[PDB]
Structure 1
Amino acid sequence: ANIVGGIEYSINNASLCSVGFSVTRGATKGFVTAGHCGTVNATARIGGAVVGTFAARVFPGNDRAWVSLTSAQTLLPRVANGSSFVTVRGSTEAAVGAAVCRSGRTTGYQCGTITAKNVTANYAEGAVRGLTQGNACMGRGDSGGSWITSAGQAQGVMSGGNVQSNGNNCGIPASQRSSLFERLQPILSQYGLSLVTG
């Protein structure tokens, strides 16, 4: 499979999540995603084919994971935006007030702005601390997907937010959305990964 930020993948033939970013760890290919999407050793599938397994994750507390892929997968420095693509150029962290977009299998590519950092989400499983908050909308299934600026600086992966009864927070105003992402920087250093860029 071609690995692009934002596409769907399933875990153990049950849950769906979105790919965050293509990365490498020495000769190993992988992608970063949300920790809540899978447990260590869970199987990831793209379009019904096995592409790899969860190599590590932290959830709750943090919400991060990386999936190690088989050698036949093609890593690309890109994030899906409809039929188009955003090129990944690095991981400079943007500040509060910056515009950012996110990509995922449920709501597609949505943009907004960063409104706060260091937010705590109180999920049913336990608190997840240090998340950054944006006001781009998102829906169930978007988890693990990319958060990136239009300039190509990868920001983090989708964690969660105030989903309404229709499964997303797209039908409420930007001012009332809380869409939280886990910062990419600490995931790359915790697992020794390097981002694929173009």
Structure 2
Amino acid sequence: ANIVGGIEYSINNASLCSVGFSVTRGATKGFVTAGHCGTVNATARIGGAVVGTFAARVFPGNDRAWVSLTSAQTLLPRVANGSSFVTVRGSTEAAVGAAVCRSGRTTGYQCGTITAKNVTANYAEGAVRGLTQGNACMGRGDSGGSWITSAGQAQGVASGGNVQSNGNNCGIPASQRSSLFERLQPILSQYGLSLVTG
């Protein structure tokens, strides 16, 4: 299938999450996503077909993971933006206060700014440190999803946030949103991955 950031994928035919970014580890193809989305070996499927399995993951503590796919998968250096697509051109980390947008199967393509870095989150499953905070809204299912700058610089993958009863924080003012994401670079660097850029 066409591996693109922001699209929905299921795990063990039981839960939903979003694709982060297409990557390669040598000759191996794959994609980064959130660690809480699945456990090692868990099976990932896009549109019904098995595309690969979770090769590794850390959560809590961190919230990262990557899925190694089959040779038949097509890796595109893009991020879904509604019907359009933003081109991934690199992984340069943006500064606090920078404009950043995210994509996920639940809320689509939303923008906001980076408001804090190295955030420690008190998740029911355990604390996760080193997260970056932004005020673009998101909802459940958006996890693993891509966070990218207006110029295509890949920032990270969606981890969590202060969702409301409706399942997201789009209903509360930006000034009060806490949307967190795991930084991309430490993921690429830990699993010796290389981002697919265009």
Fold similarity call, TM over 0.5: yes
Structure 1 residue ranges (4+ consecutive) displaced by more than 6 angstroms after TM superposition: none
1 CA distance for matches of 2:19 and 2:109? 13
Q: Alpha-carbon deviation of 1:192?
A: 0.3
Q: Secondary structure at the match of 1:187?
A: helix
Q: Quote the offset at 1:121 in angstroms.
A: 1.0
Partner of 2:105: 105
TM score, norm. by length of structure 1:
1.00
Cα deviations by residue, 1:34-78 (Å, 9 ceiling, x for unpaired): 000000000000001100000000000000000000000000000
Q: Report the Cα offset of residue 150 of structure 1.
A: 1.2
Which runs of 5 or more residues in structure 1 are unaligned?
A: none
SS of equivalent residue, structure 2 residue 111: strand
In 2, Cα distance between equivalents of 1:189 and 1:118 = 17
Corresponding residue pairs, total: 198
TM-score norm. by structure 2 comes to: 1.00
- Cα displacement (A) at 1:186: 0.4
CA RMSD, 1 decimal: 0.4
Q: CA deviation at 1:95?
A: 0.5
Q: Distance in 1 between matches of 2:50 and 2:156?
A: 25
Counterparts of 2:151 and 2:116, CA distance in 1: 20
Q: How far is 1:25 from its partner? A: 0.1
Per-residue Cα deviation, 1:66-108 (whole angstroms, up to 9, x for no partner): 0000000000000000110000000000000000000000000
Residue 196 of structure 1 corresponds to which residue in structure 2?
196
Structure 2: state its 5+ residue gaps: none
Q: Deviations over 1:132-168 (max 9, x none)?
A: 0000000000000000001010000000000100000
